[PDB]
Write a protein that binds this ligand. Structure first.
Ligand SMILES: CC1=C(CC[C@H](C)CO[C@@H]2O[C@H](CO)[C@@H](O)[C@H](O)[C@H]2O)O[C@H]2C[C@@H]3[C@H]4CC[C@]5(C)C[C@@H](O)CC[C@]5(C)[C@H]4CC[C@]3(C)[C@@H]12
Ligand SMILES: *[C@@H]1O[C@H](CO)[C@@H](O)[C@H](O)[C@H]1NC(C)=O
Lengths: 205, 69, 335, 127, 46
């Protein structure tokens, strides 16, 4: 029994048909490992097309703004009414307020300008963004000719350079080994070994 | 096939120097090391250290197989 | 169907495009007649020397559809508000084995196994032999060589379990995917070229020509036609929108939207605000799907010598340190 | 402020931060405000020698349905010059309202979330 | 109808390979356990 037990467990500490038995050992070990590999093999919206964003969801939160610009952009599409319905309960004073609120994971997601979220995530190395811009898009009263100058002001390549300098100024700022529960397994195994040794000494004398 | 041959040569040389300066054979040591490197039982203050790499390298090979798999 | 009458200057030819699509959509939104003339002088008809394409003079034309970019000199004479890409911008090793503080269980287990050995040499003369057994066994089953067997059984159990866990972890590791903006140049490298990797001289291009000497003004129009670059893959910069269009078409090309380093009507008044309002009101919904459908439209890896550099990640660290330690004790204990 | 704090930027040059007054009840807060937009305004003024100012905003036809916007409507009613700070909305309605200059930058819209993660279930099982 | 109607309905209204583990492993390894065990028993006993 001891020799067979050792044989069944891949160690060398240990006859016309005995080899036949040996056979099963091999495959069964493989099978076990196979299941481990089967256990080993495993595993957001990532766009407006995600049904959670489209279809209503009690858990997922499609956060919005305080009717600044997104409200207008969504009122164009009638199908977003339900989302606009959620917009009724997802309009906050400032984007910073929404960011702080969602830092706790209470709100699943928030839609906002690409650049603002991008550089905030740059600052916020603790969160994850989706990117994938979808709605690519200074004002003035209609009485100031200065408008032209302003446009002329920004059209310069020496000006786009200042914009790039500002970008530099501001934008600058999976092992998952089982181990732990495996640790607990090895600890309970050594405890079993200790009790077995206590039994062995008990039978010794 | 470079890694296997170069590593077996290096192991043969290191075990040969370990034995030679502590035995005053080379082919016998080379055969034992060659067997050791290839997962068979057909075959000392620091020899175990060498044994170490064996394990991991085998895993690495199998890993790549799985990567290939 | 969907084409438009189209002449250049007595022969007519099939004529239509995304520019045509947007023009006709705007006309329908405003119900304005039109004429689809064509270029006759130069590739852009620009006011090169105070002589855009149709507005080189003051009021020669009555519209502007040239997809080329919007400049200061071009814009300062006639308003050219319009949306488009803006064509701004262009062309596992360390984590192999495991994390360190995960197998501390293995050190402590080694100590407990040693102690259990201490608990067996008065229960039924083997310490150095037991020591070798322990040390050579600490590793995977491949080894050259009733609590007595029960301890070994449990040892082999969690050893094989750890090996299987390592197999799963490395399976996760190997499953991985794979695939530089500082200025208009190649990542702060010299203005032009260190004369290596010469390119980016398409003769738009004049816009960067007047930039801070445009690669030493060393552009003899080597590029010629854009498609000529097809050969030039790994033997370049240009209007980013057309570069992306060519990329869409394999020929992986530097495509960075964030870079955008370099960033539609006549001067006739009473026309800017109308079409601007029309687009700002209707475009926002249809225009993106319109463009992408009409026009303007990888984790796979097999194997390579990357395996050699990969196993080099876990080969030298052990071999060389073992050599050093062994040699240190070789010439030290012997005296 | 204490008067605005002076501190060299990352590149070393001072990072401008001009006195900016507005609401934080009713108490006027004359804080100090700064940003790339402020620098752009400085560049514009240096370009045409403006004499600028600033004013924070209160917030971001039966009885009242139309004249309720903060940014554009507030700017129009309060008499503030045609200068505005943030791109915010860029649409047809705000356009017809007053005006929209050439886009200083081209942007879109995206989403920010909290990245997930934890393996478990050894199943090495109770059987 | 033929063009708009389907997207209209689906958008407006009228709108998995994952497995972890189970005792399926036991029935699974029984697939390659009895075939060997019982045949070996018979082959030895004869
Ligand atoms: C199981 C063991 C590991 C595992 C670690 C890996 C081998 C890799 O190495 C690890 O790499 C990580 C990733 O870079 C780093 O974060 C870690 O710093 C680094 O430890 O350490 C080994 C060192 C030790 C040997 C060396 C000789 C001595 C110290 C004294 C001699 O009298 C004889 C006894 C003893 C203690 C000897 C016994 C075994 C052992 C405790 C060894
Ligand atoms: C600068 O602005 C002042 C406004 O007081 C004006 O008088 C002057 O002409 C301007 N100078 C230049 C060079 O534009």
């Amino acid at each position: 029994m001891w020799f067979s037990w050792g044989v069944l467990l891949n160690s060398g500490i240990g006859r016309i048909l005995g080899m036949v038995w040996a056979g099963f050992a091999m495959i069964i070990v493989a099978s076990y490992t196979a299941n481990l590999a089967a256990f080993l093999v495993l595993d957001r919206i990532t766009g407006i097309n995600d049904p959670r964003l489209r279809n209503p969801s009690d858990k997922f939160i499609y956060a919005t703004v305080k009717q600044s610009s997104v409200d207008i952009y969504f009122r164009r599409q009638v199908e977003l009414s339900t989302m606009y319905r959620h917009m009724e309960k997802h309009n906050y004073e400032s984007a910073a307020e929404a960011i702080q609120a969602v830092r706790d994971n209470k709100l699943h997601a928030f839609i906002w300008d690409s650049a603002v979220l991008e550089f905030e995530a740059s600052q916020k190395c603790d969160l994850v963004t989706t990117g994938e811009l979808f709605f690519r898009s200074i004002g003035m009263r209609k009485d100031s000719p200065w408008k032209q100058n302003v446009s002329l002001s920004i059209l310069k390549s020496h000006e786009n350079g200042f914009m790039e300098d500002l970008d530099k100024t501001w934008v600058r700022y999976a092992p998952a080994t089982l181990t732990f529960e495996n640790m607990a397994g090895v600890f309970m195994l050594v405890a079993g070994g200790i009790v077995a040794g206590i039994f062995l000494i008990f039978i010794e004398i | 096939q470079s890694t296997l041959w170069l590593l077996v040569g290096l192991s043969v040389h290191v075990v040969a120097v370990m034995l030679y300066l502590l035995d005053r054979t080379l082919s016998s040591a080379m055969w034992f090391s060659w067997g050791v490197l290839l997962n068979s039982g057909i075959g000392r203050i620091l020899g175990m250290v060498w044994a170490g790499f064996a394990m991991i390298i085998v895993a690495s090979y199998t890993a790549n197989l799985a990567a290939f798999l | 169907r969907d084409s438009v009458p189209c002449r250049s200057q007595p022969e007519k030819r099939c004529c239509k495009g995304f520019c045509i699509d947007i023009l006709k959509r705007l006309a329908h939104t405003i119900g304005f007649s039109y004429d689809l003339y064509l270029v006759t002088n130069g590739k852009h008809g620009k006011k090169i020397d105070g002589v855009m394409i149709g507005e080189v003079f003051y009021q020669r034309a009555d519209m502007a559809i040239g997809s080329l970019t919007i400049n200061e000199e071009r814009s300062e004479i006639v308003d050219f508000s319009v949306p488009f890409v803006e064509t701004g911008i262009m062309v596992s090793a360390f984590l192999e084995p495991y994390s360190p503080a995960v197998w501390v269980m293995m050190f402590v287990m080694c100590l407990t196994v040693v102690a259990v050995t201490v608990f067996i040499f008065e229960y039924l003369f083997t310490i150095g032999k037991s020591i070798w057994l322990l040390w050579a066994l600490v590793f995977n089953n491949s080894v050259p060589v009733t609590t007595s067997k029960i301890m070994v059984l449990v040892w082999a159990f969690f050893a094989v379990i750890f090996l299987a866990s390592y197999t799963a972890n490395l399976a996760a590791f190997m499953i991985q995917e794979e695939y530089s903006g500082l200025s208009d140049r190649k990542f702060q490298r010299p203005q032009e070229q260190p004369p290596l990797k010469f390119g980016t001289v398409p003769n738009t291009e004049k816009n960067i020509r007047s930039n801070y000497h445009s690669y030493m003004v060393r552009y003899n129009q080597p590029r010629v036609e854009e498609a000529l670059t097809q050969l030039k893959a790994g033997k370049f910069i240009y209007d980013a929108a057309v570069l992306n269009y060519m990329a869409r078409k394999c020929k992986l090309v530097t495509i960075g939207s964030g870079k955008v380093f370099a960033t539609a009507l006549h001067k006739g008044s009473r026309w800017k605000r109308p079409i601007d309002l029309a687009l700002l009101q209707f475009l926002g919904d249809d225009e993106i799907e319109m463009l992408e459908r009409l026009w303007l439209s990888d984790k796979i890896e097999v194997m390579s010598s990357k395996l050699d550099i990969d196993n080099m990640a876990g080969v030298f660290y052990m071999l060389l340190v073992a050599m050093g330690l062994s040699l240190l004790v070789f010439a030290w204990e012997h005296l | 402020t204490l008067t605005c704090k002076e501190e060299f930027t990352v590149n070393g040059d001072p990072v401008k931060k001009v006195i900016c007054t507005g609401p934080n009840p009713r108490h006027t807060v004359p804080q100090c405000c700064y940003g790339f937009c402020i620098d752009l305004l400085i560049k514009l003024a240096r370009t045409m020698n403006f004499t600028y100012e600033v004013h924070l905003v209160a917030d971001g036809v039966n009885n009242s349905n139309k004249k309720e916007w903060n940014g554009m409507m507030g700017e129009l009613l309060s008499g503030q010059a045609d200068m505005i700070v943030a791109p915010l909305t860029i649409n047809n309605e705000r356009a017809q309202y007053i005006e929209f200059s050439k886009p200083f930058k081209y942007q879109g819209l995206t989403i920010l979330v909290k990245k997930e993660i934890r393996s478990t279930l050894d199943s090495f099982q109770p059987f």
